Write a structure and sequence with these properties.
Layout lengths: L3 E3 L5 E3 L3 E2 L5 H14 L3 E3 L7 H13 L9 E6 L6 H15 L6 E4 L27 H13 L6 E4 L3 H8 L10 E5 L7 H9 L3 E5 L21 H9 L4 H10 L4 E2 L6 H8 L8 H8 L26
PDB class: oxidoreductase
Keywords: Oxidoreductase, L300/301A Mutant, IDD_06, Opened Transient Pocket, hAR
Assembly: monomeric
């Protein structure tokens, strides 16, 4: 299986990347250094993760060391919700570029379809706890993203957490100049996303699967929650293939023609998670893993469920 997938901007994207949400700032520099040393060439970042400076230190040190050339790296970041206004998009991108110590991003995503009021707070709230929306609409934010391509700041633009009607809205934008290259969505055996994936792929949009291990370190995890890494049925598939459960969970989206971005700050796991190019799940394995779907979604914000662009009211 080829290690990169061709995007609709003509560039190739590594199908395995390193996630960085929740990677502590005092550990993420070493995590990214180790990842690059063991073969990762794609890093998934975001301004809201509050660790792009430290990610950037690692990237810059490996470029300076000539462990890797810039053209071999595929660096992704995301425009946070408080920067959807057209006049804020460029500065938000520039802050990410400055922090990552780069002069372009390979891919820049609208992080969520919901725009929030600009200001210092990433989740501006009213006095009852609802997020304060922006009166920005995704189409104007998209035009601002297109301008980043034309200014040389980013090679590709895309979207994240867009439902199929929101994807369709952009694809139907009057005067659309660049199609989204990627839609990055939650996807794993408990949230298999068949409908949304088929739609995006049929339009030439590459899907990236986030939280492929079920995000066991998410801050709102409960003790009774489903656990992919502990599911005996998945452990059994892993044992049959002489692989770890995490390796099965990473290989699964790869065989659906998805990109996948498991997060770790543990050096041994960073290396383990990359050793997924030397085995194949059978069709039966794939269909069996798909059968575990329960529509169990771990990444959503209750504060956003009344936002006009909240993405998860729709079936898909
Ligand atoms: N676009 C979006 O809205 C969005 C939302 C969520 C996530 N994402 C992206 O997707 C990335 C991945 O998702 P995620 O961080 O939610 O969770 P994840 O990758 O599903 O799971 C990460 C957790 O799994 C553990 N882990 C990693 N490899 C393991 C292994 N081999 N064995 C056992 N445990 C292992 C990690 O522990 P250690 O780190 O302690 O090793 C960490 O607790 C994020 O970091 C972020 O880059 C994007
Ligand atoms: O959004 C991510 O990539 C991961 O989740 C977060 C990471 C952060 F650093 C900070 C916050 C979140 C978070 O709450 N993310 C969830 C979220 C955000 C925005 C809008 C919605 N929504 O449902 O409309 C949901």
């Amino acid at each position: 299986m080829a290690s990169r997938i061709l995007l609709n901007n003509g560039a190739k994207m590594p199908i395995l990347g390193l996630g960085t949400w929740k990677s502590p700032p005092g550990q993420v520099t070493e995590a990214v250094k180790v990842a690059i040393d063991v073969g990762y060439r794609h890093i998934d970042c975001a301004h809201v993760y509050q660790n792009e400076n430290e990610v950037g230190v690692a990237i810059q040190e490996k470029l300076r060391e000539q462990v890797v050339k810039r053209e071999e790296l595929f660096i992704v970041s995301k425009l946070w919700c408080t920067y959807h206004e057209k006049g804020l998009v460029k500065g938000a991108c520039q802050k990410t570029l400055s922090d990552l110590k780069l002069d372009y991003l390979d891919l820049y995503l609208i992080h969520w379809p919901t725009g929030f009021k600009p200001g210092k707070e990433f989740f501006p709230l009213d006095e009852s706890g609802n997020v304060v929306p922006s009166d920005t609409n995704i189409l104007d934010t998209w035009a601002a993203m297109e301008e980043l391509v034309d200014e040389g700041l980013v090679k590709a633009i895309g979207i994240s957490n867009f439902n199929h009607l929101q994807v369709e809205m952009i694809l139907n934008k009057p005067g659309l100049k660049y199609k989204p290259a990627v839609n990055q969505i939650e996807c794993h055996p408990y949230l298999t996303q068949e409908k949304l994936i088929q739609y995006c792929q049929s339009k030439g949009i590459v899907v990236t699967a986030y939280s492929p291990l079920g995000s066991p370190d998410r801050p709102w995890a409960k003790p009774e929650d489903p656990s992919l890494l502990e599911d005996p049925r998945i452990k059994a598939i892993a044992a049959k293939h002489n692989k770890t459960t995490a390796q099965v969970l990473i290989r699964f989206p790869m065989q659906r023609n998805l990109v996948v971005i498991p997060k770790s700050v543990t050096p041994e796991r960073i290396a383990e998670n990359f050793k997924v190019f030397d085995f194949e799940l059978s069709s039966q394995d794939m269909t069996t893993l798909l059968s575990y779907n329960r529509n169990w979604r771990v990444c959503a914000a209750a504060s956003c469920t009344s936002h006009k662009d909240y993405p998860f009211h729709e079936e898909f």
